[PDB]
Each structure stands twice: as C-alpha cells, then as structure tokens.
Symmetry: D2
Subunit: 292 residues, 4 copies
Amino acid sequence: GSHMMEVGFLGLGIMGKAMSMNLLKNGFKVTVWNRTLSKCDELVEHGASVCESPAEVIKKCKYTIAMLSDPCAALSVVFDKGGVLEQICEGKGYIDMSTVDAETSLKINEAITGKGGRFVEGPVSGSKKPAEDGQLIILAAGDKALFEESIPAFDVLGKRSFYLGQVGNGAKMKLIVNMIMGSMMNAFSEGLVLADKSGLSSDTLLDILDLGAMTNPMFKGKGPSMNKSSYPPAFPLKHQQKDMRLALALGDENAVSMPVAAAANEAFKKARSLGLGDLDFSAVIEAVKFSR
Amino acid sequence: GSHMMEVGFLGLGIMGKAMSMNLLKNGFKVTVWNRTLSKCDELVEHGASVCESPAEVIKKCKYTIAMLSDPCAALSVVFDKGGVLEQICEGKGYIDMSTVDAETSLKINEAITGKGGRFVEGPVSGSKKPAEDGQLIILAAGDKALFEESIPAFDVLGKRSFYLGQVGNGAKMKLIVNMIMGSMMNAFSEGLVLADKSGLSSDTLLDILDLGAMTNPMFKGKGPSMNKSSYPPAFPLKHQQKDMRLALALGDENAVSMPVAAAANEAFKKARSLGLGDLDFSAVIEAVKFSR
Amino acid sequence: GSHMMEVGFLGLGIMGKAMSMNLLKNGFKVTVWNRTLSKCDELVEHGASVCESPAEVIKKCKYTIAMLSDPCAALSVVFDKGGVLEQICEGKGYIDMSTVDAETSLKINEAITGKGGRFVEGPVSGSKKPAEDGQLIILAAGDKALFEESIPAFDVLGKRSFYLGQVGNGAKMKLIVNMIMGSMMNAFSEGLVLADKSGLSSDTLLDILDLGAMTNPMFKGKGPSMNKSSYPPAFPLKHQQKDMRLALALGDENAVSMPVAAAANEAFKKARSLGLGDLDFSAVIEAVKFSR
Amino acid sequence: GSHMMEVGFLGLGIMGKAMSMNLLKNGFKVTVWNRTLSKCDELVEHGASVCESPAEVIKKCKYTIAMLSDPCAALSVVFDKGGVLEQICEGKGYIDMSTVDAETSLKINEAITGKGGRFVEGPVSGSKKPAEDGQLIILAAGDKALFEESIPAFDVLGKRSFYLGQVGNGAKMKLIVNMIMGSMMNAFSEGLVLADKSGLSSDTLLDILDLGAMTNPMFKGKGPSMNKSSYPPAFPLKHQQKDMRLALALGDENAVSMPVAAAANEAFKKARSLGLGDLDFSAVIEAVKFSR
Ligand SMILES: [Cl-]
Ligand SMILES: [Cl-]
Ligand SMILES: [Cl-]
Ligand SMILES: [Cl-]
C-alpha cells in the first residue's frame, strides 16, 4: 500500500522496460504505459500499475518519466490525442529521457511549461546492461528544480547525473556521445575485417586491443559477438544511424566539419540497405565485410 | 662485471630511450647505438656500453634489439654501410621492434637469415609511458626459437607478448592497431570540437566519456591536454599519419574498403599541412578546429 | 516546495551528519533532530527542516531514519520523554541504522510494533568516507515491507543492501563484521610495530601489504596515518572496543570460543587506559608501541 | 641450444615447481634438483636439465635459485654432503627464496661468502597462484650487486621486488607479513564460525566482507572453500604455524608484545593437533568450529 516514491513511466522498449523494472525492483511504485500492451506483462507481475494512455499516467502521477524509441515517438506521446500535454498542469513534472535532437526537446519543453508544467530532458549514456544494473549516465537539462527533485530516481537509474543547463544541452551532449560511439564502432569494424582479410586472427586482435590504450567496455562486450557474426540488438542499428544523422545536423548547424562521423554514417546506411537495421549497431561490420 | 643477460640496442628516440633505460634499470647489460650521440648520455650514466655503429653492436652482442623511428630508418640501420647486415652470422639474433610495413620486415628477414642470422619482428602496442613502465604489448613474428629465447627481455619491456607466426604478421597486426587508434583519435576530436562549438563543455563531455562504455586510457590521458590545446609528442603526428597510410595500403592489398580510416588519414594530412607533424598525434584536433 | 521523497533523521554524529547530508544533496527533503543543536547548522544551510525532539520528527514524517552513537543513545531516543515511541502509530516507519546488539534492536522492535508502527534495523558497514560517498553496505533486518519501501533511501546511502530476515540478524551480522575489523586492526598494528622495532621500514611493510593477498582499503587508508602516529577519529576507538565486547557476548551466547577477538578486545581496553578512546580505532597501535 | 639466461633451481615443492616452471615457460634455461625425483618429470618435459645434487647444480650454473619447504631443508641443502657449499667459489651466486628466520639466512650467508660466493635472500609474498602467474612480491636482502643482476629473473617470478638491505632484513620482513596473514586468517575464521553459530549465513557474511573496507584477495579466495570445509593445500597449515612461531621469536628478540599473533599461533597448534597440518592454513577454522 505505502511507498517512499511513485512515478509514472512511458515506454517499454529495450531501455524502457529495463529502466522501469529497475525502479520497481528498487521500491518505487511505478505506473506504466506502452503502445504494445504485452510489454506490460512483466511489470504487472512485479507490482506495476497500468494506465491506458500517457494522459492518464500524467493525471495520476506528479512525476512522470518517458523513454521512447525515437524523436517521432517522443513527440507523438506528448502531442497526440490521449497524450501527455492534455493532463499537464501546475505541479506536474515530465522527464523525457528519450534520445532526441534539441529541436524536439525544445518543442516539448515549450508545450509543457506553457501549460504550467515543469520539464527535464534526461537522455542517458549506456545500453541495456547498464540500464538493468542502474549504471546509466544521466545527461540532464531543463528545469533545475525538477532535476534536483528527480535525483532519487536518477540515483536508481544511473551511477552519475550531470546537469547541463538549459533545454537542448542534454540532447546535444547525448548526440555527440553517440556520434563518437558510431564512429568508434566503424573504426573497430574496419580493423577486425582487415585482420581477417590479411590472414590474421580477429580474436587475437581483440585480445591485443583489450590490453592496450584503447581498451574499453564496448570493444570487450561487442567484439566477441561481432567475430561470430552475432548481433542481438542492444542498441538497434537503425537508431544509431539516425543518431549519426542528428549529430551531423548539429555539426551542420554549427559549421563543424566531421569527415569521420560522415563516413561512418554512410557505412550505417549501407548496413541498413543490407537489411540489418533491426540488429545491433555492431552489425555495421557486415557492411565492411561484404564481398563477392 | 657480471650480469644474467646482455643485449645490444639500436635507436634512442622516444620509445628507444624509454625501452633501453627500462632494460638497464632492470639488470640487463645494454650496449647501445644512436645516430644522435647526445641521446646516449643518459644511458651511459646508467652503465650502458656504447658502440660507434650498428655493425659493432651486432659483432659484440649475440642478441640485438632495434627500435627505430620509421621504416626508412629501420632499413638504413640494416643495409647501409656500418649497418647490421655486415656483422650478421650464425648465432646472431636481431629483433626489430620498429613500426614498419610487412614488406620492410620481410626484406630485413631475407637479408638477415640469408647471412645465417635469426630474425624476429616485435613491434609494440603502447606509447612512451607504457614503455617506461614496461607495460608494452609485444606483437612478435618470425623465428619462433629466437622469440622464445627473447621472452626474458620481452617480459621486462612489456606486460604481454603475442607470437603471431611468420614474418609480416606482426607488422600487419601493428598497423591495424594503429589504424583503429588513428581513427578513434579523429572520432574523439570531432566530438570534442562539436561540444565546444555547440555551447557545451568539452571537459564535461570528457567526464561523461570516461564514465561510459567507451572509456579508455587514450581518451583519459589525451583528453585533458587536447582541451588545453597542448600536444607534447608521445607519438608524433607525422608517424601516426604514415601508419594510417601503411594500414590503408594493406587494405588496398587485400581489397578492404575502409572509409573511416581513409577519412582520418586525410585529416592527419591536413594537420601536417598546419605544421603539426612534430607534435603529438592528438594535435589532429587542430585540423577539426580550424576556422575563420 | 515539492520533492519526490521526504524522511526524518535522528542523530548528527560522524555517520549521522554524513548520511543526512548525502540525502539532502540527493534531493531528499530531510527533517533532522540532534541533541547537540550546533550540529544542525550545516544541514539547515542545505535546506533541512529541524524539529525539537525525536517525537516531533516522527509525528511529522512517515519514514524516519536514526543513526545514533551507541546502544544507550539508540534506546534513549526511542524510550525517553519526547522520544520516538510517543508519536509512533499505524503508518509510521522507523529505521534504526545505529550499531547495537540484538537485544537492543529487539527491544525497540517490540515497542514500536506494539504501538502499531513498523521497524527495520539497518546497521551499516563502512565509515565516514563511504557515508559521504553513499558507498555504505546496509545490513537490514525486520519488517520486510518497510525494508523494500526504504530501498530508494538505502540506494542513496549505500552501494548495496542485504535483507537478513528477522530483527536481530542485522545487529548480529554487523557485530561480526566489526569484530573481524577490530581483530584485523590489531594484527596489522602488531606487524607495523614489529617491523619498526626490528630495524625495518613500517612504510615499506605497508607497500608490501598493499601489493599482496591481504591488500585492503583499511590497510591502505589507515596505514600511512598510523605510521605518522596520526589518529583523527573516523570510527572512535571507544566504539570499536564496545563493539568487540558485544561481539564477544554473542560468542558467549552461542558458546563460540574466539581467542583472537578476545585478545584484540583487551588491547583496545589498554588503548582506552592510555586515554585514546576518542581517537580513531587505529590508535590501538599505541597500545602495542608503549615501552620505556 | 641457445638462451638469453640460464639458472640453477633447487626445490620442487608447491612454490618451487610453480616458480621453476614459470622460468622455463618464460625462456629461461633451468637446471633443477629435488630430493623427490618424480617432481622433476614435468620440468624435464618442458626442457629442464636435471642434476643429482645441489652441489652439481652449483658447479654447473653461475646463478642458482633455491625454494625449500622450511628452514631445516634450506640449511640441509647448503651444508649437507653433496650440498651447495662444496661447489661455491668466486663468481657463484646463490639466491635462497625459502621462508626462513634471520638466523638461518645469516648462517647461510656467512658460509657462502666465506667460500668466495655471493648471497641473496629473496623470500616471497604470495602463494601458489601468484607463483604460477609470476605475481610474487620479492623481499630481497644481502648482496646488492647480485640482487641487481638477478632482477631479470625476479621480473619473471614476481610483479615487484624490494631490496631491504643487509641479510636478515628480508627474512624479518617476510615473517612479519606471514604473521599478519596468520592472525587475519584467524580473525576471519572466528567471524565465519560466529555467523554460522548465530543463525546467519557465513556465505552472506563473505559477500558483505568482500564489498567493504576489509575486502582482500585472501578472504575472496579462501572464503568460499572454507565455507565448504575444503582446504586443499596452497600454503600448508604446519608451515604457517611454524612461521607464526618464528615471528613471535622475532617479537621475543625485540621485546614486542603481540597478543593477537600469540593467540593465533595457539589456534594453529590446536589445528595441528586435529591432524590438519598438511591441509591449507585456512583449515585453522576447524579449530574454531570444533564442538560436541
Ligand atoms: Cl487508465
Ligand atoms: Cl665501437
Ligand atoms: Cl518541533
Ligand atoms: Cl649431475
């Protein structure tokens, strides 16, 4: 019956389900919504309440978190009928942790605060595993008071939170992080393929990389699977590619030339054309491997 | 007067001086040669013997290590007058740890074994600091017996040794490692600049990167200096760029398309054109920053 | 005005001030009480509310945490006039994280639940630094529902929480942990002194210990200070000694013979007799050093 | 046929076999001796030469390492017929890494240098696993020149070497380290048993210890086995007990009172009386557990 804290939560995709389940397992009362109903099953079994629409979650909860798959979903959840905006009022807090561009979060911000609500964007660095382990890095921006009030939730969701100032700053920081990631994954893939094609062991290359100055969790975690041509989706390739595009648009906006990000972006497009959009972004190595 | 092991050592550049000093500090008798004489001062003060030419070092020592700045130097030391080849004979071992392409090490191998000697290529992963700390990763190939006999030295120089089979394999593995490194440094630089140009803190970006899935010693170690526009040479940019070229030539040879490495290579060329060839390879960020 | 969670908090000693400040810095609304008023200054400056008695904190807050210096304080806060018990009623939760023996927590439990409240004991492993960093280990027992509801707070206070079953189990686990600690500190001290008296460097001994199978944060953190005869109190010696006594009483109760704990206990008594009770428990080394 | 370095090696017990095999696997030529012949099988299969006596090993090798099971063995190998001393002469180096008391190493030193040889004591911190992994900590004393010349071998055997000055200092440092270890193991055992007898999980206690300020490799590595009453010998209990005695004798010599070491010593004696001398020293927990 009683709890210390309660939150609404919208979106039960890979990250959403992991994050909401983490909150539930950590003593939060959670009320969830998802467009795909079956996704709610596991949360219900762990005590989650369920509402039929984002509007109902907002009406019910003072603080609501959203984790949607892409900018179009994030906007839809806010502006469509039965959406967040129709139940926003004084006292309501909305924290969108979806990965979007600044123009998207700014649009949501204007609408939410226009109706008397408070808004924080809280995009995260870290994939499915970190999400389950509460090891995400929160890149927050927007209403500073709402940010601070949300720290208890952010402390369960992640291992560190950054407040980056005005709305848009979080979005921009997140895109930059994912851009480096996309570029790195490409650099990595090129080396793995070059090793293999040159008569070497890509597995040995991986051991060498994991011992030296470039060693990182991504190489460690993705490498062995990539070498087996196995790409179960933790971060779908189509989303990574979209993020590269959004990062390059920020580059466009600020007149920053980024040839490596641009080349990596095109490689992800090629991977999509190979029908790999729904696989892990590490599947981009298939674009490098393709031959005949 | 007495020692457990003795070695000859050619080349006292950044890596050479660090590696030879490590051997001396670790109880090896070392006899060194360098074209720049003053470089020998510090080694002499720590008990190193000195010879006037590579030929003399070879004549004196059963096992000789070489660490030269580039493929042209590595070849010169072997084939020029007063060079290694003229004192090579049965019982002599030559271990070239210079970073070169396979065609270079193969050429040296044929010449050395042709005169009855044994040859190992032992290029290393890891820069100046690892070299001083004996934390290098040895990527050896060539004479397996000589490799094994050299393990005691490799155990002082590095924290791990790989035997990769026939001559050329070490060279190829090393180029692939440096190619990823060059590409990564570019990806990194693009993000740091995009953060700055977008009104964010590149320092905060760095903190975020150091906490997440991409965290690595290179970002950690180079990042803060790059953000201060400080590029003291640990691995000169001109050498990194040459390595990118050599990696891309291996790609050419094996018909592997590598757009990200190729783009990074061109960025390093631009950095050279900005007069940054003698600075650390992390100076490539200046090529991304350049505006007016 | 608004917050996600609010808690009452009793006790602003070394651990209490560190823990309550951690909650405040992490977005919790906190209402504090301490017998020493000046201790409240720093919390007030960070937004804490203040009440005149534990009774008032309980009346005001649904969930209240207590961190008191010793079993006598823990009982007093509950049973004395103006104490916790007089405002306990249905819906009230009390979480005592003080270090006490099972008989103490059991007494508090009976009284609290007798008045319709719920009770958890949540003693912690980890000193002042972990407390500031939210790196404590929570050893909880008692009302399982209240435990679960308290996880959001425990997640800020510590890095891991254990539920150990019925009331008393947490107390017992905590005493056992502190007993090993006390014994270890004694073993450590004996070695440091023996090194010094035998003509060796206690600093070198410390380096050796920190590299081997016994390496631990306590040796690392306390060692250098001990070698300088510096004992600023993180965990006062008088409290450690009392804990040894309580652990030995549990041993007495269960007919477990513990000669090493018993010897360490007597060494702590000797340290107290040297007037060192208010210093860090690492001051026990002075009992080993004493000579003439 | 050819090698960089060669060494003699006496003693193929738990540590001796691990250390000599490490040298062989690392390119050293090794000539071994052991009183138990079958122990030599595995070394022979990896290329080791074998001699019939320590005298023959010394005659053959300029540098000889010894790792014997106890002070009596260490002395016997040196002074008995067919022993080390009869082939010691100018140019010969003897490095005894056995765990002994200062009086033992001093006796060996006088005899060896008296015959024109050089002597180093190099007792090690770290058990069987570290020995196989070359992760030992070398506590050297004696001839400084011989120490330095031996660094290449010590760099393979261990991860760090300390030079502690005159003969005896290494012995004393080693005894102090093992004394803390013995005392710690006792403290640990008492807690594990108290947890179990008090109705708690000793496994949970172990998890708690491994997360906090006392966390160390010994607890981590021994704990799970101890909780299963499994004591395969890595460091035989009879040797640990003897070491406690030797440490207490050093305490006696320097008038240092060490009640915790003294109590732990007596617990090890009780374990021996239970017939546990040949098991791992972690078997001392059986002395705490014993009841009826
Ligand atoms: Cl509903
Ligand atoms: Cl010369
Ligand atoms: Cl009040
Ligand atoms: Cl023989």
